[PDB]
Design a binder for this molecule. Structure first.
Ligand code: PC1
Ligand code: PC1
Ligand code: 3PE
Ligand code: SF4
Lengths: 57, 83, 70, 175, 88, 297, 98, 155, 93
């Protein structure tokens, strides 16, 4: 069994092209990256305070 | 009909940036021709005094020009005060 | 979490704050309250020169009014 | 003394000119005239040329001087030259500066040097005029007329620059 | 006075900052020329803010729009005949 | 007296640029599941000083092939022109109230290419010259977009006087009227800032430039209000706005992969430039179409 | 006629001599060309600003937009000459002896 | 005092040389994992003032990590010479410091110290990330145990 | 004809002067092993037809330990960690 990855057949309707045109014209996938990174920022870190604390063994 | 519809559909699907630029530039090229406020734009631009209002000699034959600056005669720009 | 960036940015914030702060006050100090009269054209400049010549103390920022004429 | 400040701008302007006109390395010759480009705006600025002076820095200095430094950065002759490598450029270098200095001294001595043109070596501030400029900057209002009275130059300049584009690509096309 | 002072202090501070840092211890050419040729045309386009305040704005509208048209035509020409397409 | 202000315009910036490095690392810290520098003083407050204090103590290793003249001059101008950039900024009352501050701002921004070009050419290294060759081509490419964008938005201000910018915005942020140009300018300032031995000065220069270009955008679009009797209110609003923009410079610098060289020019000439031309055409016809041309005086 | 007119007059004259004194590099000579017209640029501004010739203030700008424009050709012929020969040397600029 | 002023200056000169030194790699082998697996959030090193950066002209300490083959030997030497002074090298991994597994093979030099003057040795096959973090900590403490200006004044 | 012009060759009949010899500038670049993109030890040496590449020569061997040669002198159990050190990304595989 297997599944494809790349193939998408993006529909060429007026509504669908609007979303693609909007995405290119007013960037939306890039702002998604900003949203993901900012959500990462507002999260406590995983760093360990060596030598005051050292990771598990 | 179908020719322009497919072509515009084609352009916006591959090059949305290009058609947007042409639409805006093509739009901006025509508004001034039928603009209803450009007539005002020249009027207010001609109503801004940079130089001194040089007086002209008084000998009669010109009742149109006022005597005092507050006199009723002469051009009035109440439109300027309103728009 | 992230509230530790604020000490990092606060120093820059205060550091960035001084230039606008410093320019705002010493202009008042140098020009005595009023801002340094901007001369973007000839008119504002020769307005200033008339003020400096009429001050007598050779300072534009000193302004004399109705008390100056009797 | 800033009495003769425009003299200082004028003289260092030409020593920068003598620098690259002495024909050093093109990149070093390039910097030899950007300083002359820098000072030339000062002469215009001291005369009231705000926009024209800033034009030298923007389209002249920050514009086509970059691509000439770019071109030298492309060519890169098998050894990039320098004033030191050539001994003839040093001879021309001293000759130009000495010739300028002596004529300046002659100019400031009797103020009646007749080389090519008779002229007065009097102070630069003298030639200025009086009279306020109103609220309009004559240097800016004059150039703004390009779209009002310059109704012909825009046509030719616009056509020529487009003609500039075609000639550039066509000859660089390499058949 | 003020201006010559301002271009004096920063260069002096830069020089001392390197004193403490020195003594203490075709296709690529073609795209550049196209920049220059467009660079010259933006020079004609710069005086626009004062040009918009002339009395005969109608003539100004035609030419200001005309110059940008030639900006577009020059770019469009270069684009369609490869040109702005950088050789890869 | 004037000398105090010039120093008061340089020293706090240099301290701010020093503490920008700590900000650059640490705002990317918790945005990386990281903590950022916290061992060098409280919350890394001494890291700005520490890095700015150890770099100068390192010997200036310059290759013999490098000409000492250009190798020193190019960094020198890279900061000095980037230091006068801060001057005509309309922070309440700007230092030099140039009638053509916009040209002064942009023209000196045009000379920052010389620092890279010479410091790359003088290095006489195959990696160095192609890097300098790449950087000079990119920056001059985005120069045309920088000027055209400015011409469009500034058309609604009235004149190139930076002091007039505050009056123009006033009630409404000018980003509302030129948001299609706003993101056009924000990408442009990112590209010019080169941000997607005698070195601490260069890093300080390329980091002071980040703050100013962010400040230039802040005064341009993200306007504010200025009370003549309390300029301090405008100060805090202005520094806060440019601080947020500098944070965004850090936000996207840790949110994107790099741009390939061909796409680097493809984005500008074939996408950014023609769209910029149309917007400039839109922003000149519209004031005439609506009789809303701003006064030159 | 003051020194500001004169100093830049001989600035062109040494520039005119420079372009007419090819050493080995046409690139160096080319760089002498635009400096030479800069002397023209500054003289044009100096006279026009001094005499308050208001409408003539356009002319110094358009002087740049053509001299710089032809400077594109000056590089463009150079950028092509350096291909076949391998350098900008005017010593090889004699293949057309006959 | 004459010794006191040189003491305060010496500390100030090297107080942050142990906190602003920035590591350099060559990343030869499996030790190149912990090389930057410490740059991962868990055992954060960016907090310690150190941060990985190649830039051979503008780095302080190089963490030699992996097996040192004879074929690469010119490359390391030219890197260490291009390395500015002060410079330190850290031998991460048994293979780097002493050949380790391949000590007897024909295409690895027996230890990095035979090629470069080698500072603090961090052992491990591979050294578990904090072991080098401990080793880096030892290097910074070694930086304090320095009398650079003191020795100059004594002479 | 004179002594000065005793060597001036007549122009080529097609006016196309003899083309110059090979003037290509196929630059050779080394993308590592110091380059971080080289992933530690990679000696990529490769040609630059301008910015366009025509052949890349990946001079591998920078980390060559003759693992199989040592495997010849160890038992099966002793040779096992060599495989563990082979793909130090997916080691257990
Ligand atoms: C082509 C498009 C641009 C040219 C036509 C539109 C502008 C006409 C114009 O400016 O005319 C100026 C004048 C007519 O002026 P006008 O009467 O339109 O405006 C006068 C404005 N003041 C008073 C300020 C001077 O016509 C010309 O100069 C002819 C230009 C050449 C036309 C043919 C070119 C080939
Ligand atoms: C009456 C109304 C008149 C005016 C109407 C105007 C038309 C409507 C608006 C038009 C679209 C908006 C303006 C253009 C913007 C996009 C331009 C463009 O080329 O886009 C496609 C381009 C390229 O998209 P692409 O790669 O998919 O390809 C598009 C098509 N070609 C191949 C031809 C290029 O998008 C980008 O360049 C994305 C950004 C790249 C840089 C990375 C950093 C991004 C940071 C984003 C977050 C921060 C934003 C900050 C904003 C400012 C804050 C102060
Ligand atoms: C409102 C009424 C009008 C509505 C819009 C109508 C016009 C739609 C135009 C659509 C785009 C143009 C046609 C087209 O599809 O061109 C595609 C092509 C893409 O080229 P490229 O990206 O290189 O890809 C191929 C090579 N790999 O394109 C090209 O190769 C050529 C690209 C040329 C770009 C020129 C841009 C000029 C500046 C923007 C326009 C300014 C205004 C000009 C005046 C407009 C007047 C109407
Ligand atoms: S010491 Fe161990 S982990 Fe490090 S390179 Fe040698 S075999 Fe690999």
């Amino acid at each position: 069994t297997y599944k494809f990855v790349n193939m998408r057949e993006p529909s060429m309707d007026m509504k669908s092209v609007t979303d693609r045109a909007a995405q290119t014209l007013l960037w939306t996938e890039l702002v998604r990256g900003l949203g993901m990174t900012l959500s990462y920022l507002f999260r406590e870190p995983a760093t360990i305070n060596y030598p005051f604390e050292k990771g598990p063994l | 009909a179908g020719r322009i519809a497919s072509f515009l559909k084609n352009a916006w699907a591959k090059e949305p940036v290009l058609v947007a630029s042409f639409a805006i530039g093509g739009l901006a090229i025509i508004l001034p021709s039928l603009s209803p406020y450009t007539n005002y734009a020249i009027r207010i631009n001609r109503a801004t005094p940079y130089n001194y209002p040089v007086p002209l000699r008084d000998d009669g034959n010109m009742p149109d020009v006022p005597s005092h600056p507050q006199d009723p005669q002469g051009p009035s720009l109440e439109w300027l005060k309103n728009l | 979490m992230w509230f530790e960036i604020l000490p990092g940015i606060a120093v820059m914030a205060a550091c960035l704050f001084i230039p606008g702060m410093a320019t705002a006050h010493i202009h008042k100090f140098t020009n005595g309250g009023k801002e340094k009269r901007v001369a973007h054209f000839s008119y504002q400049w020769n307005l200033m020169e008339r003020d400096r010549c009429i001050s007598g103390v050779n300072r534009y920022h000193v302004t004399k009014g109705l008390e100056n004429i009797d | 003394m800033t009495m003769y400040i425009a003299f200082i701008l004028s003289t260092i302007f030409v020593i920068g000119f003598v620098g690259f006109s002495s024909k050093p390395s093109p990149i070093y010759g390039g910097l030899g005239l950007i300083v002359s480009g820098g000072v030339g705006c000062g002469i215009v600025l001291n005369f009231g040329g705000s926009f024209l002076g800033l034009m030298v820095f923007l389209i002249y200095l920050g514009g086509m001087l970059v691509v000439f430094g770019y071109t030298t950065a492309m060519a890169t002759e098998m050894y990039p030259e320098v004033w030191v490598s050539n001994k003839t450029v040093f001879g021309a270098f001293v000759s130009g500066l000495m010739m300028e200095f002596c004529m300046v001294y002659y100019a400031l001595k009797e103020e009646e040097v007749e080389i090519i043109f008779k002229f007065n070596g009097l102070g630069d501030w003298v030639i200025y005029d009086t009279g306020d400029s109103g609220f309009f900057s004559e240097e800016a209002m004059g150039i703004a007329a390009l779209y009002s009275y310059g109704t012909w130059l825009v046509i030719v300049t616009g056509w020529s620059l487009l003609i500039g584009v075609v000639v550039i690509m066509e000859i660089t096309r390499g058949n | 006075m003020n201006i010559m002072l301002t271009l004096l202090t920063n260069v002096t501070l830069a020089s001392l900052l390197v004193l403490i840092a020195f003594w203490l211890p075709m296709k690529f050419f073609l795209v550049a020329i196209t920049f220059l040729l467009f660079d010259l045309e933006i020079a004609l386009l710069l005086p626009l803010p004062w040009a918009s305040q002339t009395n005969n704005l109608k003539t100004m509208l035609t030419m200001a729009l005309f110059l940008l048209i030639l900006l577009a035509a020059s770019l469009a020409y270069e684009w369609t005949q490869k040109g702005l397409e950088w050789a890869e | 007296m004037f000398m105090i202000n010039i120093l008061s315009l340089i020293i706090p910036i240099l301290l701010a640029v020093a503490f920008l490095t700590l900000v650059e690392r640490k705002v990317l810290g918790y945005m990386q599941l990281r903590k950022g520098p916290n061992v060098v003083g409280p919350y890394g407050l001494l890291q700005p000083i520490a890095d700015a204090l150890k770099l100068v103590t390192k010997e200036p290793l310059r290759p013999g092939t490098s000409s000492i003249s250009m190798f020193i001059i190019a960094p020198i101008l890279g900061l000095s022109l980037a230091l006068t950039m801060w001057v005509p900024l309309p922070m309440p009352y700007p230092l030099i109230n140039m009638n053509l501050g916009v040209l002064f701002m942009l023209a000196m921004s045009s000379l920052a290419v010389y620092s890279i070009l010479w410091s790359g050419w003088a290095s006489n290294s195959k990696y160095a010259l192609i890097g300098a060759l790449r950087a000079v081509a990119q920056t001059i490419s985005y120069e045309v977009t920088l000027a055209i964008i400015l011409l469009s938005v500034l058309l609604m201000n009235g004149s190139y006087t930076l002091s007039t910018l505050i009056t123009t915005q006033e009630h409404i942020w000018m980003i509302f009227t030129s948001w299609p140009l706003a993101m056009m300018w924000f990408i442009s300032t990112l590209a010019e800032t080169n941000r997607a031995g005698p070195f601490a000065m260069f890093f300080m220069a390329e980091y002071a430039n980040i703050i100013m270009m962010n400040a230039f955008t802040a005064i341009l679009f993200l306007g504010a209000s200025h009370d003549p009797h309390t300029p301090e209110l405008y100060t805090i609003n202005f520094v806060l706005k440019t601080l947020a923009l500098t944070i965004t410079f850090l936000w996207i610098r840790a949110s994107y992969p790099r741009f390939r060289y061909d796409q680097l020019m493809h984005l500008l000439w074939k996408s950014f430039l023609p769209l910029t031309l149309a917007l400039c055409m839109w922003h000149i016809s519209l004031p005439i179409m609506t009789a809303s041309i701003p006064p030159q005086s | 006629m003051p020194l500001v007119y004169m100093n830049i007059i001989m600035a062109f004259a040494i520039a005119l001599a420079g372009l007419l004194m090819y050493r080995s590099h046409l690139m160096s000579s080319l760089l002498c060309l635009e400096g030479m017209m800069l002397s023209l640029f500054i003289m044009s501004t100096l006279i026009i600003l001094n005499t308050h010739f208001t409408l003539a203030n356009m002319m110094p700008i358009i002087l740049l937009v053509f001299a710089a424009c032809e400077a594109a050709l000056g590089l463009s012929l150079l950028v092509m000459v350096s291909n076949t020969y391998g350098t900008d040397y005017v010593q090889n600029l004699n293949l057309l002896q006959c | 005092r004459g010794e006191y002023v040189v003491a305060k200056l010496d500390d100030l000169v090297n107080w942050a040389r142990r906190s602003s030194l920035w590591p350099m790699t060559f990343g030869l082998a499996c030790c190149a994992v912990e090389m930057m697996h410490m740059a991962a959030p868990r055992y954060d090193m960016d907090r310690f003032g150190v941060v990985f950066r190649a830039s051979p002209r503008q780095s302080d300490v190089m963490i030699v990590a992996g097996t040192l083959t004879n074929k690469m030997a010119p490359a390391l030497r030219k890197v260490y010479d291009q390395m500015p002074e002060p410079r330190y090298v850290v031998s991460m991994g048994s293979c780097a410091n002493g050949g380790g597994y391949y000590h007897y093979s024909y295409s690895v030099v027996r230890g990095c110290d035979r090629i470069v003057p080698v500072d603090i040795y961090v052992p491990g096959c591979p050294p578990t990330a904090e072991a080098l973090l401990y080793g880096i900590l030892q290097l910074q403490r070694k930086i304090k145990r320095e009398k650079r200006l003191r020795i100059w004044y004594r002479r | 004809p004179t002594k000065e012009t005793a060597h001036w060759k007549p122009p080529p009949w097609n006016d196309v002067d003899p083309p110059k010899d090979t003037l290509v500038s196929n630059l050779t670049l080394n993308f590592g092993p110091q380059h971080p993109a080289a992933h530690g030890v990679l000696r990529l040496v490769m040609e630059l037809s301008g910015e366009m590449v025509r052949k890349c020569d990946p001079h591998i061997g920078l980390l060559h330990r003759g693992t199989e040669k040592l495997i010849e002198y160890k038992t099966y159990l002793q040779a096992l960690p060599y495989f563990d050190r082979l793909d130090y990304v997916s080691m257990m595989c």
